[PDB]
Amino acid sequence: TFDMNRVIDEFDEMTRNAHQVQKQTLKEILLKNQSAIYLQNCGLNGNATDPEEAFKSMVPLVTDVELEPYIKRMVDGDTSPILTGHPVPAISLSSGTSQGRPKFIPFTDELMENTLQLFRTAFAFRNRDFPIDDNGKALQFIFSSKQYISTGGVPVGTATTNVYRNPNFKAGMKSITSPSCSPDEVIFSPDVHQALYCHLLSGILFRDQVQYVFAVFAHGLVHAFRTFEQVWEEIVTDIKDGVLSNRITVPSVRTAMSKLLTPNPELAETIRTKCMSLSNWYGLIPALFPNAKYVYGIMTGSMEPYVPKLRHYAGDLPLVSHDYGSSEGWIAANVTPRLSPEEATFAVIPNLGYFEFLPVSETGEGEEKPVGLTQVKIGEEYEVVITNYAGLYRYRLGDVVKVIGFYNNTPQLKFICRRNLILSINIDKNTERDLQLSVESAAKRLSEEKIEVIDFSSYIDVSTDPGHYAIFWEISGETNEDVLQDCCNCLDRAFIDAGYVSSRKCKTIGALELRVVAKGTFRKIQEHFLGLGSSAGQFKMPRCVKPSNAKVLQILCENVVSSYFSTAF
Amino acid sequence: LPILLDYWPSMFGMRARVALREKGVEFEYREEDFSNKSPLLLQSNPIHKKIPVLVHNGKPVCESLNVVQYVDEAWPEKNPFFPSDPYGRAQARFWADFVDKKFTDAQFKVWGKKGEEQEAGKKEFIEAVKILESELGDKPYFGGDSFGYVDISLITFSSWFQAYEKFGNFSIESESPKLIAWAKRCMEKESVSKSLPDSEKIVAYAAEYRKNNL
């Protein structure tokens, strides 16, 4: 049950208690995890009296590559548990790459608990700074329309999509948000770009009740509001006659939207008139929602260049930066959300993981040993290392954060980061230039409709006979299938190597499959990841999925706005 | 050789079979005829007359949890079922009492009855499977860093999972894949890959046990 005062004073005691609950976090994780095969090899067994000293001296630091094989074991039919434990409800991917290749990380229901409280505690902290009406709503560009099942019959999961499709989500979040604008099915509409258009429509549908405008990322809102900028003359026509644009085709979301539509001429007069009293949609969001108290999302790191466009979109309505963490674990929470985005620092919540920090103090990099949370040094930058409920045990995630100060006894973290960049020789390529080229080649078939490609990814499915390549597209607008088919063919045609040719011509790798996904999917891959708890060095999108990437994997199958196999070949 | 007198469809006996096989001990198996009790089982345990009992050095060890720990302590040199710390083996025992008691009455009744009870224990089975699911946090096993004490206790319940899949008409995997697939990991090991009988056979035992008493 959400309650401002008791939850934050418990959070206050919590942050005062940084040491024990950090210790306890580790304690319970390993108590819950005494069986991990990683750990026998580490020489661990629990209890005793040197438990902190033990692990810091006994288990070695690890990388994504070494993390690949074991959770691969979980995912691929051998329904079998590993470095933490049990066959988890969901497994991860990570931006940047594991030597150019995909990285898996498990999800258990504890991770959901990590989330509810963080949103529980932070919403209360924001409601302390921006108090909301308990009868209103929010425009939340939130998406979870999509859920794939691994080749072993196991759920493979995204952070966000495992949030909203979870059995405990709706009842769990009832008390800590203003009621969603979207019917359940459009958030989960198999066409999320149309859902986007509907979500625009959705948060717009209770404007006077809207208490804030939300996307996890500014680029999310920026793209939403640059897409706002793309489609709402279509919306006026759509909501005018009580009949939705021909752009919308998926039956369940069309059914849901048909349940709300009746003809309404006066508001078109209305809608055209306000909206350009601004010059060029500066302060488009308080214009849209005049009762919105804030814009909520990341405003630090690599999103700092999207902050201006958003503040350009936002005008002078105060901009609040949102907290940091992921499936890989939660790290920091904004308990003072009223502060400006450039100065934004977030406080760590301590039982969501047990995390250590590698100092950068020497030159770059430097052979210093990892130090604990309260012994870290203010003003200096450390790399985050993570042990949590998500299958990471003292894992080097690879990004750098600065310590700005303390909220009582727990430290404040700032993120001037961007990319976890250094890479190495992959196998899910098909040279990056070739796959980018492939997208570029086939997409100008769509550019004929005045469309560009905002993003793209790919995947290899080797459960099928023969296995096939799966390419995924995020494009600026709805079009027909015939051209998406032509694109799939071109994408095959744009993989120019002599190798690729022997394969697919001799069908020893089956016809490649283009499933065009819808908008926001790669908004969502960014969105869970600068948000990821560590440091904003988290931005290089993995571009093709070896059976070892998952967030996008849970983002592949169900939001097939269309899915097709090359009629050529 | 130590000889196991046992009962081919008994999870409890399989615990003992799993223990000995987990180790590396050469042992002799004995099939028991409950209508025609052997003189050796009768002379080992003339009271309950119950399996499994291991006679080693000419001395019988009865009851499943008691056998597996006898297996551990009589030969404590390579793959230990217990951890080194008292509170650790504690949890293994606490959950061993859990598996053999409330979890067992829940399943016994899932494969053993019709009508009200069966449904009442549809709930009880799921909720107990739920709490193990909770306790495990995320452990690839139960009682220690490898194959362990309560893993031993429950792995033999995993042969009966298909019997609980049908008469309980469940999917204990679609509600909690964590546990069965914990066993499917545990299944790759030969202690259960050579001691656990066919599951089509376990589904058969209970089905025919359902025909003979109403």
Add this chain to the structure above:
Amino acid sequence: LPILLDYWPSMFGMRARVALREKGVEFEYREEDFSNKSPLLLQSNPIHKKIPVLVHNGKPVCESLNVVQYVDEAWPEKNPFFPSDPYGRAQARFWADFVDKKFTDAQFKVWGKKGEEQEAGKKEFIEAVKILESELGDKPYFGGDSFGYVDISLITFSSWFQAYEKFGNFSIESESPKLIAWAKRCMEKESVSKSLPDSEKIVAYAAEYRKNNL
């Protein structure tokens, strides 16, 4: 300091108490009103909500027999209840498991129920008390050459022996004397001589239980 969450007529609570005092711990008892199960008890075992519970290092330790092995492993330098061999260990656990099944339920029947239920439970405890007497044979105790594991397990039932004698309107000594015999022998240990409350009161609790459910 060890916190034992106990219940005055708990044979099992007494199992914990007897065990601890036998070893050599100074510990604190808290009387529980199971109408209002404690914040620390409800945190120790949120589902069973059952005692005895010994909290050490801030780790709740539950189930009576489970608790007395905790006693062994927690202070393993002075008074062991087990012998040195694995088989002797398993014998003792075997007979502790005996104490807990048909024995417990039988007495449960003799002072808890009446009529058709009663005499069944009456022949039952006489039979249990005879296998008992038979296996006691000669030993001053059970689980070893001195005060043992299951010594603790079954000695605590001996204050109820009065309760069993009057409601049963029996005399469990003429059919089997060497046990109650053995029992007041074991009373001379300060472990049980200060942990177990008066039997006229235990009788009276059985009478309160009886007057309530007729």
